[PDB]
A paper describes a structure:
[name] is a highly conserved ATP-dependent DNA translocase in bacteria. It recognizes stalled RNA polymerase (RNAP) and removes it from DNA, leading to [name]-dependent transcription termination. [name] can be functionally dissected into an N-terminal region (NTR), an RNAP interacting domain (RID), a translocation module (TM), and a C-terminal domain (CTD). Here, we report the single-particle cryo-electron microscopy structures of [name] [name]-RNAP complex with and without ATPγS.
The cryo-EM structures of MTC with and without ATPγS (MTCATPγS and MTCapo) were determined at 4.1 and 5.0 Å, respectively. As expected, a clear density feature for ATPγS is observed in MTCATPγS. Although full-length [name] was used, cryo-EM densities for only the RID and the TM were observed. The RID binds to the RNAP β1 domain, while the TM binds to the upstream dsDNA and the clamp. Compared to MTCapo, TD2 rotates by ∼33° toward TD1 in MTCATPγS. ATP binding then leads to the closure of TD2. Superposition of TD1 with and without ATPγS results in different registers of TD2, which are offset along the DNA by ∼1 bp in the direction of translocation, suggesting that the step size of [name] is 1 bp. The interactions in MTCATPγS will be discussed in the following sections due to its superior resolution. The RID binds to the RNAP β1 domain with a buried surface area of ∼579 Å2. TD2 binds to the clamp with a buried surface area of ∼580 Å2.
Residue numbers in the entry:
A (entry chain D): 1210 to 1237, 1254 to 1502
B (entry chain D): 3 to 106
C (entry chain D): 947 to 1104
D (entry chain D): 527 to 789
E (entry chain C): 1 to 56, 64 to 1118
F (entry chain E): 2 to 95
Write the structure that this text describes.
């Protein structure tokens, strides 16, 4: 909206959510498919992709369609029903992540196969496919923002030398900071696994107890407020609104919250009165 | 100054009594005939301060000239009445009870 | 810029295209009489035929407007992009096309007329289905859209 | 617990909860003071835990206790905090507001882009305190009270008060708004110009940005108060400085139906 | 004047009584006329038959009778009561043993009575009941969703008369009964109803694949009563399974006609479906203690025959109109009455077990409270009991003929799908496909079609002519959808040569499908195209050139019209504009022939041919439900004969028996200086000069005076600190005198209130003691005008406690109600429409000389944007405009019926004659062509509009036949650069205006609870501020605006007080420190035994209260 | 549009810094009632009435004009604000 490098301290995420949800009132697969891709749940036409590279060796019995992805030493076999409209042929060497039949992809399979990055690229591609199919122009930037927010949470596989526990969930930043401190503390770093979770769960599992307390399931998350014994940091916006505080954005950003102004002449007089002492 | 972090934690009965200006005893809020808040009740002004500014309920001072001194003839001191907003009492139980949230 | 009823000009190729559609429908039913095809593919070919003739008469309307009346206000509104799609201009001059059932299956008989030539009662009773569907879809759509925006801004709020 | 005009007391149920707790508590103090048989001691402690439960949350265990002669349950502390009408959700997200107004809209073609029309009644009823201060700052009324009770009568509206009103709005800015606001252009800033009638005039080139048309759509109008809020409005939220979509960067103040038609 | 007609279709039947559904249903439900021995088993009579006797010493029922209202209808609505009659019942408490027959005539409360027109008067409010559609009872078959080759057999009784019945196929081959969300076998019930392996294999042996799958002999081991104990353990686990308890229980659920009933219509549908004939309307027959057969084995055979693919066995669509039935008002009050009777039945069953068994009058055996409370609750707070709308006569008519699916026993807004909103294949001629509200209520709320009648069974019947050979008859039979489903009905537009059909290959619906048929197989024919749509939709002329969307909006918008004080009938009508005025029960018509005797503005005396001298009073200046003037202007003069049915007096929104909603205004279609942009409409000052679009609205106010324990309230001419200069309009008792105008805030009723005891501020008390205005024992409770309103007081009403037939809530001494009217003209910012849905708000009134004008100097009055047309596909307004042009230049009105009306060449003929009578006339005074029209003519022939080479006169003729004439802008004199279309159009004025919309607030009152500013535009407050607006503000990041929005302009106290103080001090408003919401949240959290530690960045515990209320 | 707004964006790198600059400057000019300006009489924001021409009462116009001149040094931590306030009150009282 200004055709220029963005000013420091602007709140991207609210603009992002508004720009995403604005033309959703002009959608007739449509809005449930959009919700599905935001929920990352179990799809309907659950296609099967490759997981280990190798050639495709189809096997067509009249009642069963099987396929064999065949590496130098790994023949992984998949068994498909007859209605599965394929994407490949026999004698085709395909990559992991690449799908075999038509239909959408569950994202957890792609998380297993190709890590988080192709997951993010696939989600961006799907949402842009829907929105360009309906004829609505939208920069991918906001979708990138929210999907980066979606992949934030990580799982503690094994704690190692840490104070924390296994199977524990946290932010990627915290495990990264504590791991680089651990290798700066002579102790072993923690092993963490990247963990895709749904959008409502992504808002649910946050550390800022005020925002999630106010948010929803307010009874038991208020019992979580009773649980807490923690401190808050007032990083987001919702907590500053609910406490009525000056929000930390725009004019309220701490980069510009204390910018002095003065004239020339009386500034010079004050500085001269300073330097004479 | 200014606030930067907010820490939520448990309670403790000593700090409960630290916040409590006193004790509440009567099951009456205010009157119905006279509409007066009764003494040592829920709306008792000698706990939670007066309703109007710089006045005691006996009538010793009606002016800004004094501040904070407790007029003994009613029990309310001389102040701004908005300390009604920020003031708690307590009730000492005869037997301890469970904050039911940790139960429920 | 005014609108007259004579501005909705009907090109004469409409009925000739309809004659070709009539004799092709005749031939399709004749091939069904010998059992030379199923009724399924008959339905499919009929949908195909009506769709192709619909596109043809839309092209005929637009080249007629560009030929004879370039300052006709309806075609001016169309090319300017201020108001109007080509399909609305076809419904005002050519034929409405085909509508479908509440099951979504398309009727095997199209609306032969525009709005300018009037409609038979049955055609109005047909097109009411799609009109009701569109209104119901919008009235369903609004609140769920606001709901989506709510969840999104709740998760990205920082 | 306050007195309504009908004699009733608009009363929080917490007062009733505190009363029942104080009653049962001092009763059991008196009961232990004498050395009662233990059965009623156990029953009274049972009622004590029940009462303090109801105070913390009427509506967890068993029947949520009501008043005698009422089916409706009470409102506990959890009912105060949580819920759609609680503190956390409600009392900071979604409220009412002073210094506001509501009307219907109508096109005004002759305006510039950063202007909007205000009915004289509405601008009178909105900028009242500034008008009071300026009327005292002129020789029209000595204090605020004379100016107040001389604006009390609509016969007294001379022409000088209109001159003061058009003085005090010089460079002031108001906010236009239409429910429901999808994106951030749903609220705009505008400089006001006084007009006649009982309707808010509007520039054409912004109505499609509002996704608003003149089929009878209503409108809300607010006014910032602090000079900080004035600058916050006049730099960012002014319509003349907002031309491109934050969505994808296209001119939302593009021309429209009749304009494109004429060109 | 000339009233031309059109159309080539002559109908054979007229329209029925339009409101006959409501009044006919209730009049059937009452039977208040008939002697009691002929009261058939229906409604109140049927309910009294079924719920009696009481069985516990036995009391049974003889008959009932209806009393009389103590007050007439206008008196009842004056005193704000319920128009009702008491109901009395002749009763015989008969002990079987001692033969004591205590006979009495008990009193059983009141029953609300219908008005003449079909409304109800409840507490003075005008209400109405809307019919409720639902699924019909009986038996149905649906495809099983889980097992695709299988089906589910459903049996559904009357609503609230027991649960449904699900016959299901288990995965093995046995079939099972699912009742009360529970599965259990079916051979169990066969054994209970006496069906061994013998009978099952003997009759159902054709398909043993599920009958031997059904076979099991362990149930044939146990007898029906042991099977009954077994199923009592099954369906009621954790219960003592006595045989007597089991017999009584499953009799009460299966063979009880008192708590269970299959629908009589559902019984008829089952009898038609299975071909069998039922004895009763229950599931079993309680005989010999056991039960005997009703309909178990034909349904099982149908289920297996459909399972085996036998022809003549078909699943049934639940949304098909042969399977859904309507419930009128009479069924609803019958069922509510049945609920109240069952309540009093169990009440007296309680009461029968107490008391001395001899000294019992039956009057002292029954209460009347629960039944009267049931009926009163149903008429007051139920969902179907709508507050009846009376904006115009047509709106009341449409609200009378509404049809819902919502309410009790229906559907909720969450669980609403799409097919419930969809138009079925068989709505043709039974439900209007286009008349419905939009929004969330779309597809559910609707109205009846025009020629549609309802049977006693609840099925919509529809008229059709028979066709015999190639001859259509003149009789006509009503049918349902089911009887329509076995024929081939041609359309009504098909040409006829006498009764011989003129066409060759007809279009027809076979099973609702379009098909080209020979004339021989035509069995039936539609009556008229008017049988398709509703009465609102049948008003819109040229419906065959408008999209369904704008037709929907126009058909709904006609209800929101407002009656005008100089109203007009439209110049283009559809013929139906008199039957609606006749059956609306608004205007006044002559019953008998005779002569007009006395004409006055309040009453009409007529000498009849009988010689009975009859005077009708005239309801004059009547306030509507929504503040609309209603009156009956007279229409005749003394010394003038009448006929049976002539118009005597003009009702509201009517003219000479024709419907009159808007005005016929000249209008051209062109964009004008941006004022037409996005649907805004421009007018001239000529309309306001000749009082066009002017309305009258009566606003009613109210004030109660009651008894206060702090000293009761009194109403007088004196209140603390009132100048008499602000009081010169009251009477001596206190109310204003009739005739005075009033501005906002001025006193209507001066009411005292005896003061309590509290504290005023010392400075203003010092002001009162220094100025010279002391206080009294009382304080003010005066009724003043809410702001923005105002006008003339017309009528006052002063009720009191101590008057005959006044019934008030306790405490009230007296109440005052004041009627204030105002005459609203047309200003900027009001909302107009015409019949094709092209609506919009008016934008800019202009002086008349700016407006364009015809060559004769006649100016146009309304301007319309053209660009709202082609994205809407509503072309009918253009044909309306052409016809209105012809009718303007010839002075004549026209009738074009729906789908059979004036096409193009007839309009071309009429425009040719109109061009003659215009241009030859203006030529007749020696005024030829102008230069300006010559220039625009040759510019027009550069656009292919007229063929060139002609004289200007013939080209002008061609343009007039096109419906475009030249024009001259009044602002600048030169012609417009193209020919413009222009003609007359019928244009209404909508109900809502800015007066109950526009309000604004600086400061003022606050919440007595939450310290917020007030809410609602009636109560002076400010706007709702939704959270999406907060999101927009954060997207701009204007932070201080948000913080001052959350406290300073809202429920903060000290901040807003300091802000107002600084503004009247004239500086910048400062910034608050600790948040008010922050502080109260901290104290709420500390109330929850939870310490909250407000920190700085360096863990120093910062106080936010400054030690104010902390030790 | 406010005049020179593109050149005003040319001055400060961040628009929010510009906003808080003009807000604080307007607050100063209101608290010392326009006698502590940097402008000239011809640089004063005029306002045309039926009586004539007068100085504008809206401080924000003055602040934008002053920032368009270039006599206002701004930034962060040029001086502690308290001594600025004391010597501003001392040099420029009411
Ligand atoms: Mg609208
Ligand atoms: Zn007291």
């Amino acid at each position: 909206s200004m055709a220029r490098p963005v000013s420091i301290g602007e709140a991207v995420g609210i603009v992002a959510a508004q720009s995403i949800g604005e033309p959703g009132t002009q959608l007739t697969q449509g809005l449930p498919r959009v919700i599905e891709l935001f929920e990352a749940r179990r799809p309907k036409a659950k296609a099967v992709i490759s997981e280990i590279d190798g050639v495709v060796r189809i096997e067509e019995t009249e009642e069963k369609l099987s396929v064999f992805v065949e590496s130098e030493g790994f023949s992984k076999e998949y068994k498909l029903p007859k209605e599965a409209r394929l994407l490949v042929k026999d004698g085709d060497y395909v990559e992991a992540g690449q799908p075999l039949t038509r239909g959408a992809i569950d994202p957890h399979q792609l998380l297993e196969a190709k890590g988080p990055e192709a997951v993010e690229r696939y989600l961006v591609e799907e949402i842009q496919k829907v929105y360009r199919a309906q004829g609505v122009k939208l920069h991918d930037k906001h979708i990138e923002i929210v999907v980066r927010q979606m992949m934030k949470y990580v799982e503690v596989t094994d704690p190692g030398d840490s104070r924390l526990l296994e199977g524990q969930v946290l932010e990627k930043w915290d495990v990264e900071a504590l791991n680089e401190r651990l290798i700066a503390e002579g102790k072993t770093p923690v092993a963490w696994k990247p963990l895709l979770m749904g959008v409502t769960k992504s808002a649910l599992s946050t550390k800022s107890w005020l925002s999630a307390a106010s948010f929803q399931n307010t009874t038991h998350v208020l019992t979580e407020a009773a649980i807490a014994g923690k401190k808050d940091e007032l990083i987001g916006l919702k907590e500053n609104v609910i406490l009525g505080r000056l929000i930390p954005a725009g004019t309220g950003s701490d980069f510009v919250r204390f910018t002095q102004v003065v004239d020339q002449k009386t500034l010079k007089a004050i500085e001269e009165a300073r330097k004479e002492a | 100054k200014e606030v930067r972090k907010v820490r939520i934690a448990l309670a403790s009965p000593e700090k409960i009594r630290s916040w409590s200006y006193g004790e509440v005893e009567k099951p009456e809020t205010i009157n119905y005939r006279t509409l007066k808040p009764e003494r040592d009740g829920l709306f008792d002004e000698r706990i939670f301060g007066p309703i109007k500014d710089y006045e005691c309920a006996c009538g010793k001072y009606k002016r800004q000239r004094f501040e904070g001194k407790v007029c003994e003839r009613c029990g309310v001191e001389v102040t701004k009445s908005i300390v009604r907003r920020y003031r708690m009492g307590h009730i000492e139980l005869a037997t301890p009870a469970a904050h039911i949230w940790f139960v429920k | 810029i005014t609108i007259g009823i004579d501005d909705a000009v009907i090109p004469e190729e409409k009925k000739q295209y309809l004659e070709e559609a009539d004799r092709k429908l005749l031939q399709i039913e004749q091939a069904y009489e010998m059992g030379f095809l199923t009724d399924r593919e008959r339905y499919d070919q009929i949908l195909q035929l009506w769709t192709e003739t619909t596109e043809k008469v839309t092209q005929a309307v637009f080249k007629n407007f560009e030929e004879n009346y370039p300052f006709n206000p309806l075609y001016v509104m169309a090319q300017s992009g201020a108001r109007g799609n080509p399909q609305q201009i076809r419904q005002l001059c050519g034929l409405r096309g085909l509508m479908q059932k509440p099951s979504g299956e398309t009727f095997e008989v199209p609306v032969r007329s525009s709005f300018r030539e009037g409609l038979t009662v049955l055609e109005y009773f047909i097109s009411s289905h799609g009109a009701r569907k569109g209104g119901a879809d919008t009235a369903l759509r609004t609140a769920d859209s606001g709901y989506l925006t709510r969840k999104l801004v709740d998760v990205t709020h920082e | 617990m306050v007195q309504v005009d009908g004699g009733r007391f608009a009363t929080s149920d917490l007062n009733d909860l505190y009363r029942r707790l104080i009653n049962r508590n001092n009763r059991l103090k008196k009961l232990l003071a004498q050395g009662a048989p233990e059965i009623i001691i156990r029953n009274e402690k049972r009622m004590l835990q029940e009462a303090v439960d109801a105070l913390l949350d009427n509506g967890r265990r068993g029947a949520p206790v009501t008043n005698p002669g009422s089916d409706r349950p009470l409102r506990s502390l959890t009912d105060i905090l949580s819920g759609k009408q609680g503190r956390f959700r409600q009392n900071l997200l979604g409220k009412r507001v002073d210094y506001s107004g509501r009307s219907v809209i109508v096109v005004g073609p002759q305006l510039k882009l950063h202007q909007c029309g205000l009915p004289k009644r509405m601008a009178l009823e909105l900028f009242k305190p500034f008008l009071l201060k300026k009327m005292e700052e002129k020789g029209i009324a000595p204090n605020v009270k004379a100016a107040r009770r001389m604006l009390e009568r609509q016969r007294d509206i001379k022409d000088e008060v209109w001159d003061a009103l058009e003085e005090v709005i010089h460079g002031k800015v108001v906010l236009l708004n239409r429910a429901p606001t999808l994106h951030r252009l749903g609220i705009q800033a505008f400089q006001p110009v006084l007009v006649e009638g009982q309707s808010i005039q509007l520039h054409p080139l912004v109505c499609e940005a509002f996704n608003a048309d003149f089929d009878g759509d209503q409108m809300a109008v607010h006014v910032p108060l602090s000079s900080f809020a004035q600058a916050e409005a006049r730099i960012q939220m002014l319509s003349a400085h907002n031309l491109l979509s934050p969505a994808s960067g296209e001119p939302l103040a593009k021309p429209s139906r009749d304009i494109i038609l004429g060109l | 004047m000339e009233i031309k007609r059109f159309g080539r279709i002559r109908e054979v039947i007229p329209l029925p009584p339009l409101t006959e559904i409501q009044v006919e249903s209730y009049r059937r439900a009452l039977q208040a006329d008939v002697p009691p021995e002929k009261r058939e088993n229906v409604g109140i009579q049927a309910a009294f038959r079924e719920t009696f006797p009481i069985e516990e010493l036995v009391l049974d029922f003889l008959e009932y009778r209806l009393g009389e209202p103590p007050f007439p209808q206008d008196e009842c609505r004056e005193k704000d009561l319920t128009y009702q009659a008491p109901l009395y019942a002749r009763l015989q408490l008969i002990h079987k043993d001692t033969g004591l027959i205590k006979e009495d005539e008990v009193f059983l409360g009141h029953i609300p009575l219908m008005t003449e027109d079909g409304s109800f008067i409840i507490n003075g409010a005008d209400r109405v009941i809307v019919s409720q559609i639902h699924r019909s009872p009986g038996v149905y078959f649906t495809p099983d969703p889980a097992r695709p080759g299988r089906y589910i057999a459903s049996i559904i009784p009357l609503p609230k008369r027991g649960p449904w019945i699900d016959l299901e196929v288990e995965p093995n081959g046995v079939v099972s009964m699912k009742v009360n969300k529970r599965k259990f076998p079916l051979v169990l019930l066969l054994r209970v109803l006496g069906y061994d392996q013998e009978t099952l294999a003997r009759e159902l042996g054709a398909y043993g694949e599920l009958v031997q799958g059904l076979m099991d002999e362990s149930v044939f081991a146990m007898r029906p009563e042991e099977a009954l104990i077994r199923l009592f353990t099954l369906l009621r686990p954790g219960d003592p399974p006595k045989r007597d308890k089991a017999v009584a229980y499953v009799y009460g659920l299966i063979a009880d006609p008192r708590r269970y009933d299959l629908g009589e219509a559902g019984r008829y549908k089952a009898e038609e479906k299975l071909g069998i004939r039922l004895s009763g309307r229950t599931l079993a027959r309680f005989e010999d203690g056991e039960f005997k057969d009703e309909v178990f084995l034909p349904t099982l055979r149908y289920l297996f025959a459909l399972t085996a693919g036998v022809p003549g066995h078909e699943v049934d669509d639940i949304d098909h109109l042969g399977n859904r039935r309507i419930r009128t008002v009479g069924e609803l009050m019958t069922d509510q009455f049945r609920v109240g009777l069952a309540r009093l039945a169990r009440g007296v069953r309680e009461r029968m077990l107490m008391g001395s068994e001899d000294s019992l009058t039956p009057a002292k055996l029954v209460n009347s409270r629960p039944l009267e409370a049931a009926i009163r609750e149903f008429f007051s707070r139920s969902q179907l009991s709508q507050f009846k709308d009376e904006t115009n006569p047509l709106s009341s008519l449409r609200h009378k003929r509404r049809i819902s699916a919502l309410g009790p026993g229906g559907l909720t807004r969450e669980r609403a799908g799409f097919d419930v909103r969809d138009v079925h294949r068989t709505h043709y001629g039974r439900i209007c496909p286009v008349e419905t509200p939009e929004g969330a209520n779309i597809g559910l709320i609707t109205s009846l079609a025009a020629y549609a009648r309802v049977d006693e069974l609840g099925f919509i019947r529809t008229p059709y002519r028979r066709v015999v050979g190639g001859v259509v008859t003149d009789e006509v039979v009503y049918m349902t959808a089911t009887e329509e489903d076995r024929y081939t009905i041609a359309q009504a537009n098909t040409p006829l040569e006498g009764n011989r059909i003129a066409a060759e290959r007809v279009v027809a619906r076979r099973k609702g499908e379009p098909v080209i048929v020979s004339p021989e197989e035509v069995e039936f024919m539609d009556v008229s195209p008017k049988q398709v749509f509703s009465v609102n939709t049948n008003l819109i002329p040229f419906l065959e050139h408008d999209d369904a969307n704008r037709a929907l909006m126009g058909s709904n918008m006609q209800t929101q019209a407002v009656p005008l004080i100089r109203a007009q009938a439209p110049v283009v009508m559809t013929g139906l504009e008199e039957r609606v005025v006749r059956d609306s029960l608004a205007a006044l018509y002559a019953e008998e022939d005779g002569e007009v005797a006395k004409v006055d503005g309040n009453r009409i005396v007529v000498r009849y041919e009988d010689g009975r001298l009859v005077e009708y009073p005239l309801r004059r200046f009547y306030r509507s439900n929504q503040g609309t003037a209603l009156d009956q202007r007279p229409r005749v003069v003394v010394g003038q004969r009448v006929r049976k049915g002539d118009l005597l007096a003009d009702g509201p929104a009517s003219e000479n028996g024709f419907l009159a909603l808007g005005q016929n205004v000249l209008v051209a279609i062109m964009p004008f200086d941006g004022y037409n942009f996005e649907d805004a409409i421009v007018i001239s000052e000529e309309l306001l000069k000749r009082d066009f679009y002017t309305s009258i609205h009566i606003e009613r106010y109210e004030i109660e005076a009651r008894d206060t324990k702090l000293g009761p309230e009194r109403i007088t001419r004196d209140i603390p600190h009132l100048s008499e200069a602000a009081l010169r309009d009251l009477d001596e008792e206190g109310v204003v005198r009739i005739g005075a105008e009033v501005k906002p805030g001025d006193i209507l009723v001066g009411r005292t209130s005896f003061k309590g005891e509290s504290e005023p501020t010392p400075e203003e008390r010092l002001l009162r003691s220094i100025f010279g205005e002391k206080a009294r024992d009382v304080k003010d409770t005066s009724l003043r005008v809410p702001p923005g309103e105002g006008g003339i007081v017309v009528r006052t009403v002063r009720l009191r406690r101590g008057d005959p037939g006044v019934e008030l809530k306790p405490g009230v001494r007296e109440v005052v109600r004041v009627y204030v009217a105002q005459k609203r003209k047309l200003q900027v910012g009001d909302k107009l429409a015409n019949r094709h849905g092209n609506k919009g708000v008016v934008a800019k009134i202009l002086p008349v000389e700016d407006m364009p004008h015809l060559p004769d100097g006649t100016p146009v009055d309304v301007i319309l944007n053209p660009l709202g047309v082609p994205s809407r596909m509503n072309l009918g307004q253009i044909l309306e405009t052409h016809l209105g042009l012809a009718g303007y230049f010839l002075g004549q009105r026209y009738i074009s019926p729906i789908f059979d009306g004036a096409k193009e060449p007839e309009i071309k003929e009429l425009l040719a004659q109109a061009f003659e009578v215009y241009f030859g006339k203006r030529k007749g005074e020696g005024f030829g062509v102008d230069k300006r029209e010559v220039e625009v003519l040759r510019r027009a022939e550069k656009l292919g509009l007229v063929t060139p080479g002609k004289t200007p006169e013939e080209q002008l003729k061609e343009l007039f036949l096109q419906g475009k004439v030249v024009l001259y802008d009044g602002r600048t004199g030169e012609p417009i650069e193209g020919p413009i279309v222009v003609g007359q159009m019928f244009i209404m004025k909508l109900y809502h205006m800015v007066e109950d919309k526009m309000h604004a607030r600086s400061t003022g009152p606050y919440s007595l609870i939450t310290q917020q500013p007030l809410g609602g535009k009636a109560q002076f407050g400010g706007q709702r501020f939704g959270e999406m607006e907060v999101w927009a503000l954060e997207a701009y990041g204007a932070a201080h605006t948000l913080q001052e929005m959350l406290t300073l302009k809202s429920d903060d106290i000290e901040g807003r007080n300091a802000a107002y103080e600084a503004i009247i001090k004239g500086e910048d408003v400062p910034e608050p420190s600790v948040p008010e919401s922050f502080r109260v949240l901290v104290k709420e959290l500390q109330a929850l035994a939870l310490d909250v530690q407000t920190l700085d960045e360096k863990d120093n515990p910062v106080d936010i209260f400054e030690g104010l209320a902390s030790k | 549009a406010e005049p020179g707004i593109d050149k005003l964006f040319g001055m400060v790198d961040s628009k929010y810094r510009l906003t808080v600059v003009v807000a604080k400057r307007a607050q100063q000019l209101l608290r010392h009632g326009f006698k502590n300006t940097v402008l000239e009489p011809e640089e004063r924001p005029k306002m045309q009435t039926l009586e004539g021409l007068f100085d504008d009462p809206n401080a924000v116009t003055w602040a934008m004009k002053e920032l368009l001149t270039g006599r206002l040094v701004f930034g962060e931590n040029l001086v502690p604000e308290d001594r600025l306030q004391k010597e501003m009150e001392r040099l420029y009282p009411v």
